[PDB]
Amino acid sequence: FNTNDETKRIVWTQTAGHCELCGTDLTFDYRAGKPMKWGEVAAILPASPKGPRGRADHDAEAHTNDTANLMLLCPGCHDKIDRDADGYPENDLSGLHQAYLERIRLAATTPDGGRAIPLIVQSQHFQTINDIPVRDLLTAMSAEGLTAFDQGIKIAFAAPGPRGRDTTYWQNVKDSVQYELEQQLKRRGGTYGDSPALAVVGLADIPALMMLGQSIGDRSKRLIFSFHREHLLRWPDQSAEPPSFLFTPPPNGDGPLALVLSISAQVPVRDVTDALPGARIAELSIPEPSYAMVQNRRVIHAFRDALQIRLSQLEALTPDPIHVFAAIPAALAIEFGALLTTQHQHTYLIFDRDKENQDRFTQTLQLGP
Amino acid sequence: SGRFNTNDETKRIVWTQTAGHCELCGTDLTFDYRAGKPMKWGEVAAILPASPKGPRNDTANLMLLCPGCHDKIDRDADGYPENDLSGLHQAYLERIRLAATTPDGGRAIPLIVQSQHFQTINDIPVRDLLTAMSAEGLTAFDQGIKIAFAAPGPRGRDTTYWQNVKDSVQYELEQQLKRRGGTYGDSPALAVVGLADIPALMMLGQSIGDRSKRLIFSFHREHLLRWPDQSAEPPSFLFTPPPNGDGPLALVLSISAQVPVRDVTDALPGARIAELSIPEPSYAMVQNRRVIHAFRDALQIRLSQLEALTPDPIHVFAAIPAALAIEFGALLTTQHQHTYLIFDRDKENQDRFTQTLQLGP
């Protein structure tokens, strides 16, 4: 009941020589520098019914060389699973094993889609941890055929100080987007080239994400990704159709012009007029506002095209600034800003919810020429 | 034209780093072995340099191809390609490597939070969370965090009490922030289960948020910390909006059971009741984590509607599973904050709903 050499070689091959339970590279010893095959081929169901996970109904003979029953493991993970059969049951190991092999198979069968710079931009203005994993962006990239020369750029804004999101805070945000990011992109010019693709995901203040989009909007190969509460960086549903984007035009008059975006949620009119008395409200919405609505990149593009029409319509109404009140997903805030890089050179005054002022909207950044 | 010769050590390295697929068409070159036939490594694949011959083993630059793809590649007399494939080849190896290291993306912090009541009658040992974590690839590397909500002081569960609960949980959560590792230095995931009164669980959600790699687990009366049925579809979440009027706005969540309307109006005279329910309310309804996500999505769609109706507080009367209470609290951690007044039944006052927690302005 000994696994033969051919089967052991298949196990090493189908796992790419990494431990299926911890991911460590079993083909090399990085401490001393020698190539060495230090993994072990491990049986889920043992040959003896008295072994760990042993069961009589298992016919050892029939599965000695069955790779569905054989994992590549490091010595430590192998020792643990054999010392704790109840804690590493057959069904759980089999499920992890099949999931591991399937990730390899999908990687091997994905067409090459070129290089991109991974870019994560995140704030600290929430009262919870806010952290996008680098691995998840790289995995979403790979699923689309994109790879990177390095793990990329990850910018975390300084947290608000004791006065909240004050002038200092927004200066820091400006410096992070317009100076820190630019410096880190310059350091990648030699490895990625003059005009590289940018695989960008943000989870940060809405005004900050708009400023980010304005800063990078003139990059022709920007590839927007999205953090999703359920799916993390995985697109929820590549087949989903974008929603209708409904628009209500502003009333006539000379009051300040407000653009209200009700996409993540319905922005209450009372909160807009409280912050901007006399506002003339134009609203872009979807039928069922929802935090979950960024189902794929086509949704993002459909938002962009809907917005492009309405920004033209509003800029034709007035030379004065447009005041923005947005409950929108983070990926849509980036795309909003990218429309302002060149296509829409009007002044936009971005309002945002203010925890220091009982959730009222207050004016934050000015965007535009 | 020519063929590139390699020794056997080089073939084994190349087969391993490519996982035995052709790098140009993706075909799995172990097909013979899968059919029960001998694996003829040297006949079902060709190994060639990714780049044309330069002016000057180097296994990192050798490609694994199927015979068909190899024959389609123009080659010089030494078996080098006439056109560069290094970009495609390096990208192939990077995609394999990223998949192969994916298990270290499961580095995780276990967190169990219970009330004193449930710690006394229904203690959840770390072993129960750890084995459920391990089954879905979440791997703890240090002792799990097991804490109880603090007993209230003389002022009861006032604003300061709840802020102290949040501070205490978030202090423990500094492990999630700081104990970075794996291939990329990512912060570890949080694996969290709660069993406590619904207001306390909402404050646990307030503490953890929903903008990090975080997996909620659920204690189930029959299945403990294992998910009852990973294939179960989430139920429909039904909603009835409130009647129009000036009375206080109440949101009733009838998910574990049907909350009787009279208990709500008794506790909140004049209440205008909106209700979120499922077709068959049940203590057992958290069949998998997708049920929790689906609850969140439906809830937020309706909270958007309710919050727009009035500036005044939403008064919450919830019969919901513990994991759903955590997600409810986590949902309300945006910058935007509407006022929510959470009621909970007092067993020592005839099970009457009493206001227990305020969220927002």
Place this chain on the structure above:
Amino acid sequence: FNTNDETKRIVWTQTAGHCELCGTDLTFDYRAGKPMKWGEVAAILPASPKGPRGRADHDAEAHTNDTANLMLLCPGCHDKIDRDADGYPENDLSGLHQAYLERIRLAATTPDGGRAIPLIVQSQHFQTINDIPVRDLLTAMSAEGLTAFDQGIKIAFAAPGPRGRDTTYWQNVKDSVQYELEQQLKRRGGTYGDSPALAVVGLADIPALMMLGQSIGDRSKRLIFSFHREHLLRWPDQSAEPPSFLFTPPPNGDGPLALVLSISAQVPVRDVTDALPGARIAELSIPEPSYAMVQNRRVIHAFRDALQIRLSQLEALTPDPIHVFAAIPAALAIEFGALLTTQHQHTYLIFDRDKENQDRFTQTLQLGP
């Protein structure tokens, strides 16, 4: 040639059940939660001369139960050392083995010194990485019997923006020290009690470390540690005698009063009068200014004692602010600030080298009342 159970028990004991080469806990499986002894007792010199590191002059019988030859290793580390004898030679393993055992013995014989909050404060104002390892502070704490309930507080200032250390930069520094730090200490109020000991090390802007010192100067049980270019967080020499702190009193006059601290290096008088024309210079120095001079905490105490006298004497000369020009180690910058909380309530205007003005001194923070 079979190591007996008594000796295996001693090996497990003297290593505290961790892998001597990677430090992993071999008494417990953290993934599934079962106590398990999954380590291996490993021989440096093998019983057979044909084994890894084997040699003919090794009397295996004589060393079967010789704990100098027996390491506790995890299965992975043990596999590697047996697969690459040239990369893990006998003398190198023996040295690592003995060093590991001595660290355990020293920890076990250290008298208890109570609990303390670990605090690391570091800037990003250098043109190189600046990063104090958490482990090294905890290890210096443990060498003095101090332990903590968590790995502690680590505050990293925001980097200077594109304008250098501007008003925004110093506002961020103030917020990091006066708000961020206080919030982090507040979260620990219950765990550590009311007036806990504070084990603090800084490597940050001199004016910022002085402000840090002022913020913690009224604390009881403040325990300053020091980052040293040779010894990291270890005190260089506990037996070293503190240097004499030489003092040159200021000239009589009506010009602005400057305190020059020449401890790390000699501050050139020319640079002080350039920044503050007509300065009346008082100077505190040591006989041989040196970056390495913080040999132990008694040196910091001696600096405090000297400053007590000299600040009193300068403060009696004028009601006007005192202008500070300091080339001093980071630990002494904290100590200087700590004297301003209650001992010396006078206005101090801190100058610092300005990389945006050709290394000239420019005024930065104002400290004191």
Place this chain on the structure above:
Amino acid sequence: GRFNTNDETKRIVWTQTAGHCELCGTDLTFDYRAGKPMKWGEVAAILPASPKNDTANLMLLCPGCHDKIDRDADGYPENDLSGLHQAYLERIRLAATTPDGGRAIPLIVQSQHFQTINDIPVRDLLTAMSAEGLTAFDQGIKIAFAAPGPRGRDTTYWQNVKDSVQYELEQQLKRRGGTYGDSPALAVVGLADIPALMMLGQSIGDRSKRLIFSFHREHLLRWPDQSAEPPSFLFTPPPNGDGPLALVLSISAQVPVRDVTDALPGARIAELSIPEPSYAMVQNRRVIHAFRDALQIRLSQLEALTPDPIHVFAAIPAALAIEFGALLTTQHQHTYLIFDRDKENQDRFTQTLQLGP
């Protein structure tokens, strides 16, 4: 009065305490060390830390310390000891996990010239690292300086060198790990021209966990003698005068003063040397630290002496050139003008690098 334990409980408690009394620190394996049988149950007592099970709350005490503890009839303590017990276990744990503080990045930096005559392989740095407890987790970084363009090694060239080195390291320093999430240590060896090595030092600094290694003609990347004391460093102060201030470093060899005044007429020469200048003098890392300490003591004097640049003429080993560069990375910056020998222009010194404002 006595709490009783079986063998398995003893195994656990002895292991988590490393076999010392938690109250006085005495090593309770003394008998075994003397060659006598280990009498676990007689050289120590185990009792709960708290008045009143879980092996985590059982303490190991020597008989004397156990005798001084008031106990109830079941052997539980009357007074709580859990704080001292938990602190003791923490100190043991911190020591036992110290090997994971060795996570490290290998870095080999060479010039094309020295790569041709003396290529340093990663394997050699890794084995020296491993012997010191430094543990790489991925491929080592092996780089060489770019060739200059037509403007030579000017300000822009050296700034691009620094930027490329720091970028290369950034990727690895993000790979935090171990028990506390610390960034890995840098293990660096350089073999290139002295100016390039100083710029390597400028890139890495000296305010992080970083260990320099040294290539030695006899011992390669292994330290010649870990026990060797560092040499004394002999200082010649510069004469008074108006000429340009020169610092001559005669560490590898004695630099002839005439070669300096030829390159820099009128030079006021300060010198730092050792009693026996030698290519072999980097006997251990403490020699490098001692060089930095002596150097900075004198640089403090020289920088205070004049606002003008310090002109550097250095016969120093490669590892010391790196540390020279790293020393000059404070906010404070004095101008240094670095000279180097042009072996094909009759070994004449020529200015090749400026550090400072």
